[PDB]
Amino acid sequence: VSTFPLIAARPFTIPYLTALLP
Amino acid sequence: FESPRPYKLTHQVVCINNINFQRKSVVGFVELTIFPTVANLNRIKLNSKQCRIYRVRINDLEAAFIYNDPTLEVCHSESKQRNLNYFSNAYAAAVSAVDPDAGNGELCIKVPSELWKHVDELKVLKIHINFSLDQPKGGLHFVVPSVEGSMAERGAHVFSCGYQNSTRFWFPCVDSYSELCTWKLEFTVDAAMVAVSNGDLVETVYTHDMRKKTFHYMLTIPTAASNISLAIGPFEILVDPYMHEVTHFCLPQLLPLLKHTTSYLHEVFEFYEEILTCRYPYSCFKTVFIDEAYVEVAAYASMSIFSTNLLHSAMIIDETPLTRRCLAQSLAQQFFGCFISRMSWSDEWVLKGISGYIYGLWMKKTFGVNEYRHWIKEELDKIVAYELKTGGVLLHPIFGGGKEKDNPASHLHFSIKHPHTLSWEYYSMFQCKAHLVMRLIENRISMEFMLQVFNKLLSLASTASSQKFQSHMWSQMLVSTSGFLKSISNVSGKDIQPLIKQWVDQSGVVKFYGSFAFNRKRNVLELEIKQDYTSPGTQKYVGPLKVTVQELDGSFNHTLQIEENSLKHDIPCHSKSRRNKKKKIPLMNGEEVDMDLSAMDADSPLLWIRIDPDMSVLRKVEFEQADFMWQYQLRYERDVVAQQESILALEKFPTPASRLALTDILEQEQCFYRVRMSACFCLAKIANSMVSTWTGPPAMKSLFTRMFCCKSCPNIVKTNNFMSFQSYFLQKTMPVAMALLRDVHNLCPKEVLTFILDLIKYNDNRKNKFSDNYYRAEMIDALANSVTPAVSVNNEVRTLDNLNPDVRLILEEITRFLNMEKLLPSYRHTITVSCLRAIRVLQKNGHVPSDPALFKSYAEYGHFVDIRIAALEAVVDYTKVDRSYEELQWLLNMIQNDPVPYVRHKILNMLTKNPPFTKNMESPLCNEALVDQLWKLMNSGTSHDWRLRCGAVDLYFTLFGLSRPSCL
């Protein structure tokens, strides 16, 4: 929790509308 | 000439009704228009899978019904012969029997004696079949956002992905290729959800006036069954403005991206009819984008249906090739998935030949004739690498007919009559050899004659199309290998049947020991070099060709070759190039300007060896020159081919600092992009050879100095360094090779480390209009190429130092970018992908411990493909080196169980490229039960698609190929 607390994965419903959105 | 297939066919009608999103099924009736060939044609066979028929009928007569699935397992489930060879042969014979290209049975409705006497009277019938696709478990796709309440209405789509003959898996037909028919197609659609298939919008108003709509697509143009596919749900954009009928379909909130994406298409159609001298031989062209692909390319009749990864919406520069690159394939194969058509699987190669070659011709006259040649070199890279991994990629006309084999290329599996035996490695290299054999047909025959041939092809085809069905006189659109060859020789009869029997019919790559000798080294013998070759395992002996040599400032000397290859040969000699302080430039190549006496120039009137710089013969050339000649070729040559091959040859051995000098000199001009990328990797290798010979500086910092002035750049280059795409790729590449620069004390790239961290600091605002994305990605990969294997001397894996020291800084940066792309996300989580590769390489040096649960949490369902695909590559190497049995079991269970095809494709592909459990090295004990489950997954659970069990065939190729697995 101190040095590197990476956010875990969300995984959500619709990936393409998110990852292909300027 | 003709088909050995009876019962000629004219027309067919589909009618999809009651398409479900909840129990997720489809019902429909088909009708077929048949002219039978001979009487007693009783057990009429069609073919499909995963199709519960509801009823069959011929003219209000439900006749008989036969329904087998030998595409499933062995007739005994415990046939203990659990090796390759029996399974390969048995499966080959099995699915050959599944094919109706013989008297066979999958759907043999028997004709009753009433209707048999009608056959004796009239061989004209109609066939009406009610049937229902279930949840499609290997034929179709119901892409569903996991909401199911309301967004199942707006947010889902439905289509058919599949391979060549997957029309079987969608609705019952023939051996689906090579049956010329025409179709009327009835589509029960939502009023919003638009369905797109072949043919034309022939009958649609607000249809049936009740709650929904219903579409009539009629394809009048006579085609075959493996072109038909229906994508249901997207949104219309005509992206017409230049050619008025170009039709595009994409999911909502994706639309203006097409407004950038789709254009340049008009230029492509302009190019293709500059080739073919026709029009786009159709009504319209239809294009569907989709979040999935069984295959990224996929191209059907008047319609290409492929992924929503290729939008490249106006700011995303690195898909400047790729998008229209793949669009090129989705037009060219279109035409030859249109009209020219294989008479058998063993007849195809001309198809993919001419299609891929045509879009190679596109790649000439669209961008980068030097990148065109670069692309050809990568083709040879793929082909040489694969047929030295494996056996040949052969283009049969020849059968093993009569239960015969005749297969030296059965190094794994069957090929002769069948698509569905092959690997994607094999099928890819099939297409690659297709490109290069059409280049050989350039090499014997005029491009103008190629235009002549193809125009004659399409003239005869388009003539033979679009008529009243000339009875018995119609199959001219099967334009396969033999008559095509005949038409070639009719245009110009040359000795191209030797070209066939060399390259079409001897699948062998040819290395070359053309051994450099040096006559006129003030020698009595004059300018001589010996020809040599022998290297079996996979060899081939090609004789009579020629040889291309550059003199000092003089003739491109070209010299014949022979078979019986213990040969010595001469050169059409240069002049006495003497007093060359005075002979400064006697015309090297045009008005090129160069002077060096730096080489061994007492008696060296030679400059460069070459065999066939236009890359005729499939080659892997091995020889030796003076290193001066290689470096001076890198001072200039008019071939990217020559430049990167001297890049490789000087990546092997040398380290003078003059090498470094000429490398950097090569990097700073207008020469070529990717030349400079491999030149960076040259500097990487050679400065890694500078441990005791650190003569030059800490390299390449001076290259960022002397090449990059923002505002004269007072010691650090920062800002806005784009719109000049030489510099774009070059800045994208160089710090990776800088992160390679290591000299053996602790390999110590500390200056480079801190420098790259500073590069990551100084990134730009929206002054760069270009989405500063991949630059981040490869700076991250440079950090991934800061491979430090040797910190943990004894046990330092386990939070001990909070492991130290620069590794932690790299961890800080990658942690930042992972959470930024969790927040920003910029374009496909491409940064996240490079990060995941970096984190695995950190596990491969034992700094963050070898634990998969991160990557496991990125192999999950609801992420992007590319994330998921890189996580699977990672966890595959995890199960390679680490011996995790359990996650392997998980992996195979997910190979069984997930909806996405392309992950199964790539799991099995790079699982086989990067295997654990490697054959005859069996420490992790596959013999226990893993062979059992693997044999099961070859048999069971894999009738979804062909290529999944083709990959399982590849698994048993690699893991314990040609034998018992040492179980019993």
Side-chain angles (χ1 to χ4, degrees):
Chain A
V1 185
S2 64
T3 64
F4 304 101
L6 279 169
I7 302 168
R10 193 177 177 178
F12 45 84
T13 61
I14 299 169
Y16 61 95
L17 287 176
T18 62
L20 206 57
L21 179 65
Chain B
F1 290 162
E2 295 177 353
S3 69
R5 294 298 307 273
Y7 51 92
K8 297 178 181 179
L9 305 174
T10 70
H11 185 76
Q12 187 185 10
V13 171
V14 85
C15 176
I16 170 172
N17 297 315
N18 291 319
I19 171 169
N20 192 352
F21 290 163
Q22 301 298 320
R23 302 294 185 268
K24 291 173 289 297
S25 176
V26 161
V27 305
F29 60 93
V30 70
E31 289 174 355
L32 279 77
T33 315
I34 176 166
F35 293 166
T37 301
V38 73
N40 289 317
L41 191 57
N42 300 319
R43 299 183 291 172
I44 298 173
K45 177 183 175 182
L46 262 68
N47 198 354
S48 70
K49 286 192 74 174
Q50 296 180 358
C51 295
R52 180 177 177 179
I53 309 301
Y54 278 171
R55 72 103 176 271
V56 195
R57 188 172 66 91
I58 297 171
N59 295 318
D60 289 331
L61 296 176
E62 177 167 1
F65 182 80
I66 290 171
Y67 182 74
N68 281 320
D69 284 323
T71 312
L72 300 174
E73 314 189 358
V74 182
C75 296
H76 191 271
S77 66
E78 293 179 352
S79 67
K80 293 181 181 180
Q81 298 173 355
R82 291 184 180 179
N83 306 332
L84 175 66
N85 301 315
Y86 171 69
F87 176 71
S88 63
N89 296 312
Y91 183 73
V95 191
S96 70
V98 176
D99 294 327
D101 287 323
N104 294 314
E106 298 295 326
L107 299 175
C108 283
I109 169 172
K110 295 189 179 182
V111 173
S113 66
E114 300 173 353
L115 294 178
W116 177 69
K117 291 180 182 179
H118 291 292
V119 167
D120 306 335
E121 295 166 353
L122 292 175
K123 297 177 182 178
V124 175
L125 288 179
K126 297 180 180 180
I127 298 166
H128 176 75
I129 297 168
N130 191 7
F131 59 96
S132 66
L133 295 169
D134 295 330
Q135 289 187 358
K137 293 162 187 173
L140 304 182
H141 284 288
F142 295 164
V143 175
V144 174
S146 65
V147 179
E148 295 178 355
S150 66
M151 297 167 65
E153 308 165 352
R154 292 186 176 182
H157 72 268
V158 166
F159 68 103
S160 78
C161 254
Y163 197 72
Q164 306 170 356
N165 292 319
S166 62
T167 307
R168 291 186 176 183
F169 299 147
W170 175 38
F171 69 101
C173 288
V174 201
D175 272 328
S176 65
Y177 211 84
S178 72
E179 298 296 326
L180 294 173
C181 292
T182 176
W183 283 269
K184 190 175 182 180
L185 305 178
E186 183 172 1
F187 291 150
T188 302
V189 302
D190 190 5
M193 298 178 72
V194 178
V196 176
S197 72
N198 303 332
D200 296 326
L201 299 166
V202 297
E203 189 74 26
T204 294
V205 295
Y206 182 74
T207 312
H208 72 80
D209 294 330
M210 199 67 68
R211 66 180 180 179
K212 285 185 180 179
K213 287 178 67 66
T214 298
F215 294 163
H216 287 282
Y217 283 165
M218 184 181 288
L219 180 58
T220 308
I221 293 97
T223 67
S226 287
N227 281 311
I228 309 166
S229 63
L230 187 66
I232 308 169
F235 191 81
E236 290 187 352
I237 295 175
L238 283 171
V239 196
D240 285 335
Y242 294 159
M243 291 181 69
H244 303 283
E245 282 180 353
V246 188
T247 319
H248 291 275
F249 293 93
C250 286
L251 298 173
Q253 296 175 353
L254 297 178
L255 305 170
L257 317 182
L258 287 176
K259 296 288 186 178
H260 180 77
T261 299
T262 301
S263 61
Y264 300 136
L265 178 54
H266 306 285
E267 190 73 23
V268 183
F269 291 164
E270 290 168 353
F271 189 78
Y272 278 184
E273 298 305 331
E274 282 189 355
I275 304 163
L276 296 172
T277 316
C278 294
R279 287 184 181 177
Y280 166 64
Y282 263 151
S283 63
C284 294
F285 169 65
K286 293 171 281 184
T287 307
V288 175
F289 293 178
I290 276 167
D291 189 14
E292 269 185 352
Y294 184 72
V295 177
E296 283 288 330
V297 178
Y300 289 154
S302 61
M303 178 172 62
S304 60
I305 295 168
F306 56 93
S307 74
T308 312
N309 304 328
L310 304 181
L311 278 168
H312 173 63
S313 62
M315 295 174 71
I316 315 170
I317 286 176
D318 266 326
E319 291 191 351
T320 298
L322 281 173
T323 299
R324 47 251 185 92
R325 164 80 176 175
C326 285
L327 277 179
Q329 294 182 359
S330 70
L331 298 169
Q333 264 192 351
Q334 177 180 3
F335 295 161
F336 297 153
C338 283
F339 289 159
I340 303 176
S341 57
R342 67 259 170 99
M343 287 182 73
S344 73
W345 175 255
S346 59
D347 293 327
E348 184 162 9
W349 62 269
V350 176
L351 282 173
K352 285 171 180 166
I354 301 174
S355 71
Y357 167 68
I358 278 169
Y359 96 96
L361 292 178
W362 174 73
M363 284 180 66
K364 284 182 180 179
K365 300 290 183 180
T366 313
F367 56 99
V369 183
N370 305 321
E371 285 202 354
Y372 168 81
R373 296 290 171 185
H374 166 75
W375 179 64
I376 309 165
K377 281 183 75 170
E378 289 180 359
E379 294 293 321
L380 280 183
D381 295 334
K382 280 185 178 180
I383 283 176
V384 170
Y386 183 66
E387 291 195 359
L388 291 173
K389 283 182 181 177
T390 323
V393 180
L394 190 57
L395 310 182
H396 276 287
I398 298 171
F399 284 165
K403 297 180 181 180
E404 297 173 354
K405 296 177 183 178
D406 290 332
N407 293 319
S410 61
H411 301 284
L412 169 54
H413 62 286
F414 180 78
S415 63
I416 299 172
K417 296 181 180 180
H418 209 72
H420 313 303
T421 319
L422 310 177
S423 81
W424 277 86
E425 299 180 357
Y426 187 79
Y427 180 78
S428 58
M429 294 309 113
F430 175 84
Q431 295 185 358
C432 296
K433 280 183 74 175
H435 302 293
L436 305 186
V437 171
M438 296 300 111
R439 297 185 180 275
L440 282 174
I441 292 177
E442 283 184 348
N443 291 318
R444 286 187 182 179
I445 281 174
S446 165
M447 294 169 64
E448 297 174 352
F449 293 165
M450 303 174 82
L451 298 174
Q452 290 177 357
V453 169
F454 302 155
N455 195 2
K456 288 178 183 179
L457 297 175
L458 301 169
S459 69
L460 295 173
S462 62
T463 305
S465 69
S466 70
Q467 289 172 355
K468 203 186 176 181
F469 183 71
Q470 301 177 358
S471 300
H472 194 273
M473 295 172 71
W474 194 258
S475 70
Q476 297 175 355
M477 295 169 69
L478 283 173
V479 199
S480 70
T481 300
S482 65
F484 166 66
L485 169 64
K486 293 177 183 179
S487 177
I488 298 168
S489 298
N490 288 318
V491 172
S492 179
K494 294 182 179 179
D495 296 333
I496 58 174
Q497 301 174 358
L499 175 66
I500 295 166
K501 292 182 182 180
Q502 284 177 351
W503 303 105
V504 178
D505 287 332
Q506 184 65 41
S507 59
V509 184
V510 187
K511 289 186 180 183
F512 291 100
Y513 297 148
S515 60
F516 166 73
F518 49 100
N519 275 320
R520 279 175 72 186
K521 192 58 65 183
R522 289 177 184 176
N523 285 325
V524 178
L525 296 174
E526 296 193 355
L527 290 174
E528 302 178 357
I529 280 170
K530 296 184 184 180
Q531 299 181 0
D532 292 317
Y533 179 64
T534 292
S535 75
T538 302
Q539 71 179 356
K540 188 173 175 180
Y541 295 160
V542 177
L545 307 159
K546 286 184 77 69
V547 173
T548 298
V549 179
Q550 289 202 6
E551 299 175 354
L552 295 182
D553 294 341
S555 70
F556 289 168
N557 286 326
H558 312 303
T559 306
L560 296 172
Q561 304 177 9
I562 316 166
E563 288 287 334
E564 292 180 354
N565 298 315
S566 65
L567 294 172
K568 306 177 185 178
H569 286 273
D570 309 335
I571 294 160
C573 292
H574 186 71
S575 67
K576 291 182 181 180
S577 65
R578 301 299 181 188
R579 295 292 186 270
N580 297 319
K581 296 181 181 180
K582 291 182 180 180
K583 292 182 181 178
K584 293 185 178 180
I585 301 156
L587 201 149
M588 39 190 70
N589 276 321
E591 289 183 353
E592 294 168 353
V593 173
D594 272 326
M595 287 176 67
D596 274 329
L597 297 172
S598 66
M600 288 175 72
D601 292 328
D603 289 325
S604 68
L606 295 169
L607 283 183
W608 300 290
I609 304 172
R610 176 58 56 204
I611 299 168
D612 298 331
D614 298 333
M615 302 169 68
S616 65
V617 167
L618 311 181
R619 66 190 184 184
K620 183 176 177 181
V621 181
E622 301 302 322
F623 68 100
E624 291 176 355
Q625 296 177 356
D627 315 335
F628 299 149
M629 316 177 88
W630 301 96
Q631 295 178 358
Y632 200 81
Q633 205 170 11
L634 295 179
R635 190 167 78 179
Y636 191 71
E637 188 67 28
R638 289 181 176 177
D639 276 332
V640 177
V641 175
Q643 289 180 359
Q644 285 199 358
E645 290 301 315
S646 293
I647 274 164
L648 297 180
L650 299 177
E651 271 188 350
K652 286 188 178 181
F653 64 101
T655 305
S658 67
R659 179 66 194 91
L660 309 173
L662 294 174
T663 314
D664 302 333
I665 286 167
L666 183 57
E667 289 162 351
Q668 301 181 356
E669 279 186 357
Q670 293 180 355
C671 297
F672 191 73
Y673 307 163
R674 303 173 181 269
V675 161
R676 297 185 177 185
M677 297 164 69
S678 59
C680 293
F681 295 148
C682 293
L683 290 179
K685 283 187 180 179
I686 297 168
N688 288 317
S689 70
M690 285 175 64
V691 178
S692 67
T693 317
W694 179 68
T695 304
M700 300 170 73
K701 294 182 181 180
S702 62
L703 302 179
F704 279 172
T705 301
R706 295 176 181 175
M707 301 175 74
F708 295 98
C709 288
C710 299
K711 290 185 180 179
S712 68
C713 284
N715 303 322
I716 288 169
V717 184
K718 295 191 180 185
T719 306
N720 198 0
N721 291 311
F722 287 166
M723 297 180 70
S724 66
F725 291 166
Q726 298 186 354
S727 62
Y728 175 66
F729 287 162
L730 189 60
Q731 281 185 354
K732 184 180 175 180
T733 296
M734 288 190 63
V736 169
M738 296 181 73
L740 284 168
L741 300 181
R742 294 176 199 181
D743 284 334
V744 185
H745 302 284
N746 293 313
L747 294 173
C748 304
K750 300 290 184 181
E751 299 179 356
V752 184
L753 287 172
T754 310
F755 173 70
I756 285 171
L757 309 177
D758 293 328
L759 297 173
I760 297 162
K761 291 183 178 182
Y762 297 144
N763 290 318
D764 292 334
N765 287 321
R766 283 189 177 182
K767 291 182 179 179
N768 274 316
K769 288 185 178 182
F770 282 155
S771 70
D772 308 332
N773 192 7
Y774 294 91
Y775 192 57
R776 295 171 183 166
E778 299 300 320
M779 287 152 65
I780 283 169
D781 286 339
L783 300 168
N785 210 352
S786 69
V787 177
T788 310
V791 175
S792 67
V793 177
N794 293 319
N795 287 314
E796 287 183 354
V797 192
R798 298 174 183 88
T799 320
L800 295 178
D801 297 336
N802 286 313
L803 301 163
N804 50 0
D806 301 332
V807 180
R808 189 172 183 177
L809 298 171
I810 302 164
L811 286 174
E812 289 186 351
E813 281 177 345
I814 63 171
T815 306
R816 281 177 181 166
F817 281 104
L818 282 171
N819 297 315
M820 282 170 70
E821 289 290 317
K822 193 67 174 179
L823 278 171
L824 284 177
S826 70
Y827 193 72
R828 293 180 174 176
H829 319 276
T830 303
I831 298 167
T832 298
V833 168
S834 64
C835 286
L836 287 173
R837 291 170 185 167
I839 300 162
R840 177 156 178 81
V841 176
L842 290 178
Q843 285 193 1
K844 284 186 177 179
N845 297 321
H847 305 305
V848 173
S850 67
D851 295 329
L854 290 167
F855 296 152
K856 183 72 168 71
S857 62
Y858 276 151
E860 293 172 348
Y861 178 66
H863 293 292
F864 201 72
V865 171
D866 302 338
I867 304 168
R868 196 169 182 179
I869 219 160
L872 290 172
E873 299 171 359
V875 70
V876 158
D877 269 333
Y878 182 76
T879 312
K880 177 184 177 182
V881 171
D882 194 0
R883 194 174 161 177
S884 174
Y885 176 76
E886 306 172 356
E887 287 291 324
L888 176 66
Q889 180 64 41
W890 171 68
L891 176 62
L892 267 70
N893 289 312
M894 196 166 73
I895 292 163
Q896 167 57 44
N897 198 1
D898 52 351
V900 181
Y902 196 75
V903 292
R904 292 179 176 179
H905 176 75
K906 296 294 286 186
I907 285 162
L908 294 170
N909 190 7
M910 289 193 78
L911 182 64
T912 312
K913 294 180 181 179
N914 288 313
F917 278 83
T918 308
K919 181 183 178 180
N920 294 318
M921 298 173 71
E922 184 177 355
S923 63
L925 304 174
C926 191
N927 285 120
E928 300 176 352
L930 189 60
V931 183
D932 301 331
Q933 292 187 357
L934 279 167
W935 181 258
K936 288 179 181 179
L937 280 172
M938 298 186 79
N939 271 314
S940 64
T942 328
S943 67
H944 303 288
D945 298 328
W946 299 107
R947 73 183 182 178
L948 309 174
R949 53 182 59 192
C950 295
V953 167
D954 303 326
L955 292 177
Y956 277 7
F957 175 71
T958 304
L959 312 174
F960 43 89
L962 297 173
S963 70
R964 291 293 186 185
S966 70
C967 293
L968 290 174

